[PDB]
Amino acid sequence: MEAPEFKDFAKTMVDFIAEYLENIRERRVLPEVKPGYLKPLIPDAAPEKPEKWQDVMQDIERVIMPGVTHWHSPKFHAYFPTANSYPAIVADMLSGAIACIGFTWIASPACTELEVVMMDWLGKMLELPAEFLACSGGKGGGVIQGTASESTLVALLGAKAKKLKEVKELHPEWDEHTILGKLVGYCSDQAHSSVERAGLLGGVKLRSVQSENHRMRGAALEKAIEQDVAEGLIPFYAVVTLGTTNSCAFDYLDECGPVGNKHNLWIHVDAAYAGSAFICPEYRHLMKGIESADSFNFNPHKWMLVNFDCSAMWLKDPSWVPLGRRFRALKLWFVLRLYGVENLQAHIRRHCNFAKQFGDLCVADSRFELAAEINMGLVCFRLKGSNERNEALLKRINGRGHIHLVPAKIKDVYFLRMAICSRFTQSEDMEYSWKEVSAAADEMEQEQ
Amino acid sequence: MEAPEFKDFAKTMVDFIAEYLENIRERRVLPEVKPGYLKPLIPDAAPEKPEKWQDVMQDIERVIMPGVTHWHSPKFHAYFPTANSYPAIVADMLSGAIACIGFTWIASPACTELEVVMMDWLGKMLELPAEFLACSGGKGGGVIQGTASESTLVALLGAKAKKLKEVKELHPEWDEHTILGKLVGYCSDQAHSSVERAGLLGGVKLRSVQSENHRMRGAALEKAIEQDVAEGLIPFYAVVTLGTTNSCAFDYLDECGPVGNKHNLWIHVDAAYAGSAFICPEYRHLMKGIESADSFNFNPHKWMLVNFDCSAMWLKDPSWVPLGRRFRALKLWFVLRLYGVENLQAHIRRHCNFAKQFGDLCVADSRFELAAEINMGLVCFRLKGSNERNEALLKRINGRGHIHLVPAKIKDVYFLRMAICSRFTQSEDMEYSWKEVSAAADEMEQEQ
């Protein structure tokens, strides 16, 4: 394919994307086609000769779209938002043309320097401590990782190296294997499975700390640390979760961070989803204790309109664990510029207010109860009574094909989750979604 | 930003991308700007109000391009190609609009089903043994991973789980932990650092097997295995490399495979770069022994024109280790359709021929010697004499700013590498790059 054909194809795809997203409320949330539908529709081998882009383009509605899950439909409540925005789509077109994966070491000023400045822009937006800002002139700064799962692992590895070095310095006679066998990390029992992943891949012990009303307390963390010290183990790392995946609960960073500092554990803050809200002054209280953190992560590619991948991680000392891989700073720059801070804050606030609106509708119905306090864009709720009736309700709702919801469970309480996902959501969607839940419950009751 | 503005912006970016790539020979391979150039060019904080897309576009040539490394310039010889093609750019626009990270498990027909068919399309193009193909009705099939590094780890983790489940049966009195501590894997001393990474993250011992003429022999692998068993260790995994990063040498898969088979080690084949050549019948002999492999991986995102990320991995039983994440199948489909088999074959062949051409020009200069047999798109060469005079030469060439080359070292032999990276490369580029090397050597000689 030559440039003129590329231009015709690409500009046609621009038209297609705008048509798709601007009219997304027309799409059905349950696919009409059955598993196995695709193979029949396309040949069994690649073509020997080049096909026409117009024919590929025609195959998008014919072959692809019937089998697509519409994540950006305001009728679709996935686990958390998947960011999409027009500025990020345009940046990624350019990154596609000029970036590399980073196999051959990227020594390029633009990739690296834009990443440093964008992490400062975003760090200022979050009012992060100066120690995390490159422009403060210290050791601190940030990197854009691919995922929060990667960020958690990277921080665990940095913490591991740091503890290794410190324990060696103090005991030159001990070998690495002996030191490494003693290392223990900590996280809440509500922490994401990526922490467990990180413990396994990092080759260390991980302790789950029992949370209180879904939130990890400093005293519980400290108790856990002390027990392991009494066993001769070496606590080295703890993950504090701001916005748990099950119910968007917040660990007490203002307790746990100081506990970690006091005991010389690296404190990593996983705020993958909820961290986007910290650009709003009214939600910044939720990361009180941030000064105690060794590393902090959130994903703009969930709730801050930056298409995947974009997981923003700051460290007090970035060296302990590089830059411009994939030119991810380009989409971050485009979004921050073409939205501006005000519009991004408006986006967070609108979503919080929508979740509250839905929670108010829900609790007004005496058949239902919240399963957790409402936080951020997430409402956890259930019919009063049994788990099985709730399992039934969720099944019925998803089967009716007007909206989609997802379940979760915390210690024997099964509940339904409504997360605000689509950037196209409006308040009337909350009314629509609630009325659909209620209508489904009405139907269950009247199954005699 | 709304759709009409998005369309104006995106279509202007399409114009920009075509202009950039189609005239990429105009670009200087050495950045003119110095480190630190970027910060003074842009504001120190995000804008409160949204900016205009036109001002962002203006800033691409003003702020970004002065500091960009032009990976796709035919004057730039990085470690290996970074795939770029127009069909893949257009696929990624759509994927950006409709795909998700996979946080919420994609239960989506199109994403999953397209991945299966494309891996069969591609597996046929490589003439992989029927056992790796999903269309053969067996347990085998393929997944599109993000990187060869991830692929190698995933295979290691599968092999680990498989061995552990085997050893638990023959030693029901042994600890699970006792078994794990005994596990040992193998790779060539020329294998990529990603194998070491997999060993570390996989929590197993890894043995570097001494290569001969940069190639791992079956006997050397067997000797290392038997040595370890002799100390009560448990061999479980080996990586056979087809196209090493240093010199594009090929391990003896025909020897190593059966060695692994005999001693019950999972054999993973890392063909990340050179694997793209196996779509050509005349190069398929380089994976003789492929029947003996448990997994096989190469990256279309290096040498097969599929923009990152796209690492294609086949397994004889893919259940020892979740499809459709990021909808990577879409770009593979677009590339295979819009190039067709013949054009992709022609791409590989031209690059192999260009490398031979360059090698001929090099050896004709009696001051130079090849540092390895020419394979695929790579020539390894050096001035006869010291490593130090070769380091000077490389620095001199890169400093001259007409072409860019990279260095490598195999057991105290330092050498320069010319790999064909750019899809825009032409025959005369070989003459240009050779003449530049020779001119630098002249310029060096005429100095004392």
Residue numbers in the entry:
A (entry chain A), B (entry chain B): 1 to 321, 349 to 475
Provide the authors' original text about this structure:
In this study, we determined the crystal structure of the typical Drosophila DDC (drDDC).
There are two protein molecules in an asymmetric unit, which forms a biological homodimer. The fragment of V322 to P348 of both subunits in the structure was highly disordered; therefore, they were not included in the final drDDC model. Each of the two monomers is composed of three distinct domains. Based on the above features of the structure, drDDC is a fold-type I PLP-dependent enzyme. The active site of drDDC is located near the monomer-monomer interface but is composed mainly of residues from one monomer. Upon superposing the native drDDC structure onto the pig DDC structure, we identified a flexible loop in drDDC structure, which did not superpose well.
